[PDB]
Amino acid sequence: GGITEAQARAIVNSALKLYSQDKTGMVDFALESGGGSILSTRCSETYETKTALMSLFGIPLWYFSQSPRVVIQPDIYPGNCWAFKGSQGYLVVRLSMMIHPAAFTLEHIPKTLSPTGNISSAPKDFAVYGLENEYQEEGQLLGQFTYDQDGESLQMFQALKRPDDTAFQIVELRIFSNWGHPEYTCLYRFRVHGEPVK
Amino acid sequence: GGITEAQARAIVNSALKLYSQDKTGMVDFALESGGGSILSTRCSETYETKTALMSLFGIPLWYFSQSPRVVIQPDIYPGNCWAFKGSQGYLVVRLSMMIHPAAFTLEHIPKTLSPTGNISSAPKDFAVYGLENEYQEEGQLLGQFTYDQDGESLQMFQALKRPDDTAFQIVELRIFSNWGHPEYTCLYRFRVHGEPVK
Amino acid sequence: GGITEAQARAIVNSALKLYSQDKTGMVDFALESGGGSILSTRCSETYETKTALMSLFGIPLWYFSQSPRVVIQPDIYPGNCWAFKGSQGYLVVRLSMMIHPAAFTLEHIPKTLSPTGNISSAPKDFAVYGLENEYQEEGQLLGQFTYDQDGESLQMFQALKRPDDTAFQIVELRIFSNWGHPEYTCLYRFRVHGEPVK
Amino acid sequence: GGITEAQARAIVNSALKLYSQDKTGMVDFALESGGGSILSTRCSETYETKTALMSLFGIPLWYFSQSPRVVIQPDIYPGNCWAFKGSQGYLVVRLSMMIHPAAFTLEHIPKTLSPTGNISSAPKDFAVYGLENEYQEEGQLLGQFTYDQDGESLQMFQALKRPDDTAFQIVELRIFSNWGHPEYTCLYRFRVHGEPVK
Amino acid sequence: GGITEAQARAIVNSALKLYSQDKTGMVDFALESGGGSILSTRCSETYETKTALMSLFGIPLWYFSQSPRVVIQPDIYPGNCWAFKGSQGYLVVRLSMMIHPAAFTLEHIPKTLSPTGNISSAPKDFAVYGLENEYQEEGQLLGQFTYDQDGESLQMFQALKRPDDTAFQIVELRIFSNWGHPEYTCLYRFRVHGEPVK
Amino acid sequence: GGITEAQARAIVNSALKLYSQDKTGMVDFALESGGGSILSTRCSETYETKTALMSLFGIPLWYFSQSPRVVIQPDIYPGNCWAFKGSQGYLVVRLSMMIHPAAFTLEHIPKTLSPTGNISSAPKDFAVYGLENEYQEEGQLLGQFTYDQDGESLQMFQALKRPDDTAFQIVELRIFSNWGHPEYTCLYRFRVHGEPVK
Amino acid sequence: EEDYSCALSNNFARSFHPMLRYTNGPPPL
Amino acid sequence: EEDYSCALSNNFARSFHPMLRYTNGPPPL
Amino acid sequence: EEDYSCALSNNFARSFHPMLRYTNGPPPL
């Protein structure tokens, strides 16, 4: 019933190898360094706090706030997230290749690293759509989901299966609710997985 | 006496989960991206080496040296540290929230990654104080400690316990000695842990 | 024959400690933050794609491509690599200290994170040389090697042993072939290991 | 019948004194340094030639063309003029004070300083209007005039007299034709004269 | 008693030759392009109006106000002057050569070019001093004078004669009163004349 | 024998009209604002004095020296000149139009405005050549001349007459000697006159 | 109509030429 | 209607955050 | 005394390293 030292070493080494491969071992076709980009935020309003002041020699220069581009960058230390006003938001992403989308990942910080002890700014209900071109107003539904505030930091979601599989190079993420924060919603990272067209 | 494969997998997965949470699984109220900031270095002198020259088309542009802000940023590759002249230094940090401080973390690179084989620039004796406002000259002692050059890279230190627990949003780190480097002392990362006031 | 829970915990903790030390637990004398630098690319031509456009208010500003300096920086997410035209390339690196070189490391992304499923842009045959000064045209051979596209992401290579061990502070990496990409070759990270002269 | 040396000196000195007072001895309420400004050019199109290239170290930086603001600046060396496409143009000017407008000045270079020997780009038929606010589409006519290509460089024009004199702080210059240039029309300087409201 | 055409032409040509030589035909040792500079304004306060806004694409960039350096530059169109708050002001000028100062010039715009019809912002009572070094608080008096608002635009003033003539390369202009403007005093140009030490 | 007041006024007004037309009443095909440009200075060395320091907040920013372009700009206040080392210099100018060159103008400041009382930096012997293209090393001689230090500020020089008149759009000015300054030679303005090809 | 659209426009405001506007007060002179 | 105006908008494109767009080709990797 | 002057000083504020100060509110997270 019990394992040997050699077998324990193999299990440890295999787990660290997967960890080192962006945690998942799967291509992220939204990743900015790999060819993904942010096209649009529609009518979303980036939350303007006016608290992060950059200065030199005592001279005020600029107020700093995070860009929507941080959602397709891998750092997820607290605060490395895009914040929009209210709890409804929109993000249009161009993928690095034309693919058949099969799954999506959403990450948020865990409660143990949040200074208040809660993650009420995290997204709750959301959906993903496939678009044929940047200017399409309503795309094809790829799935509707809920990010669970009592789950793990990284959560994965499976796309709907249809008898005809259409390929897309643009997707739209829509956030419909958050976990109760009354001023804003924060998005740390969104990933898109699937199979490239041959 | 022996463990099963299922039990070994659970131990591995739990260790990687803690590792991914900033190694410790505890909020760092000094972290810059999360709301902390560097207010002052008092009379400390940043070490001026004049060796890192930035150029374009062969035209010299700027000499590069690290900012005190790197002490509240998480990268700790060799050289990603703040260096001050001599072995006495001062750093005044504003926390992201008002808290009851309970513990502090100090990190330095390990000897195996230092090109000389020693870490003589690391801090040795130090203390932490709580301040009521930025312009206070002498704060309340929260503890005095020694970073052990023969210990682990990341070391944690417990604050003094008093019958009345006062809350602070500003702390001061004072370094009194180093591990023998004759020109400078290098600080890689300093963290502050505790419980936020309700 | 079987291991205890205490023994399994010790194996896991030892593996994460090595992982945290730049994966290898060995000094990298080429690392830029630690004192290494890129001196020259000889006649190599950085691949000019003209696809990554930076803009503001709809106004085009700049086309972005990666610098040769990224080869001595630790991020290896897809795209964080230096690309040169064809499959022959040159990189002259100044080390942080004068050393007796003993081994070299080359990293590339794994196939599971490459959008096409192949890594045909990876380097194949290469060699390393020691130079006495920046302007030397032909150095002393330290070894000739092949990066294996069916191996692990990180691969290590042992320098030639000679009866007289000469010290160097400049090395040259020469790439002679790639794994079949018809337009370019991509280099993610190159490291240099050894013993500093006393 | 003849004049003395003293009388000749007085005539010369009086002529140079008037010359030194902006040639005319009258306030120009459109002058930029004195408080005038350019608000708008309506649908006028600045002529885009793409011939004046600024470079440094052989690197192209910027194409230079003159701003509409040059029309209320006093330098009138050849080329120090605003050029618009075709022969219909619009310029909305805010005066330094609220005034009763009484006269206008238009300047162009003389033929003796034009390299071709003609000034076919000069304005011909034009009119001036008074506006109550910046967003008014049609103002009150203050006069219609023709710049004479066979006259002097500096020409002055008298505003219409009406039984009720209205004050204005915004005027609009409309150019309806030029002296035959087939690609553009060039304006060197426009001035506005009158009496400030008390 | 009467003059000939040849004699009249000679008088005209001689007057234009003097006019072209900076109006006076005398070296100005304060002129910036010729080697003069502004060292200090002591406790003078440049008048902050916050009315001249520079923008691009509708984005506010900078508020413009004139520098003390304009006092040693030759353009004197309305508004090309240094304005300080109140009616007491100080200007410390370093001359292009060490000289025996013999005379000073002050210019203001004439009333015919001022939009209000008055020049109440012009300086009235003033004095000039010679200083041995930049940090001297009280220099040697070279003369005290009044700019006459009913005189010519350009006025000249003779330095005091003493039995021992000391040389200076720094002078200080002190303004004690103006012609009645209640908010500021405007200085268009100040010149210094004399003989260089051999 | 004597003139009337009307005749004296006509002579004065005619002289001021010519004065206002760039002093000469003739097109300058080298003028920068009108389409001329500086192509090259060959092996001339701009005189590096390192005395004109620009600063902000006490921080040194830049040393200022005049560009060769100032030679085709009309301001000739003292110091608004191009200075080259020694007394041999070269300037290659592209004209605004293809012309038959007929005359050249050279200006220097007069002695009465020079602080030393001499103009020993002025050019003395010089020649002008016509070039067919920018890269021609030796052009066709258009004339050889001497600027007279005892003459007027502005001096004009007539091109050689040949039986066949060739047109040029590039000219080269060569300076062979100065009026004795031991360190440099200063050029204030150079003009080119003639008839454009039809 | 073309006449109505021209009044709407302000091409100088959408150019690379910087604007200088006096916000309701003459500068010192 | 509000639903129709939101599709029209793109607030990120009119912000001070610089945009990075790949013009129809993946970068080298 | 030296001990009293050090408290007065703030060399980071007079350096070429830009400062980032949170004006009394944590950023979104």
Place this chain on the structure above:
Amino acid sequence: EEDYSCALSNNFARSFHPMLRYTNGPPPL
């Protein structure tokens, strides 16, 4: 006293107007 403080000051040196100082030599002319 006010008279003694004014001599100490130099407001131009702490402004946003750039300074131009000739370091002991006239420029070419």
Place this chain on the structure above:
Amino acid sequence: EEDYSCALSNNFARSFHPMLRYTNGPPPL
């Protein structure tokens, strides 16, 4: 020879003084 090298050179083109070149057309005037 020195005479041949001078023709080759163009020190203005390798200086910190910006160049302004009219690419085959006079500007509007």
Place this chain on the structure above:
Amino acid sequence: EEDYSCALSNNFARSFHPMLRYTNGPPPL
């Protein structure tokens, strides 16, 4: 020959990528 010209060249030094060179001393670490 091509082999001799390549040694002469340094395309990185004539690019728009800024260079960082340590002038004979390791930085603090």
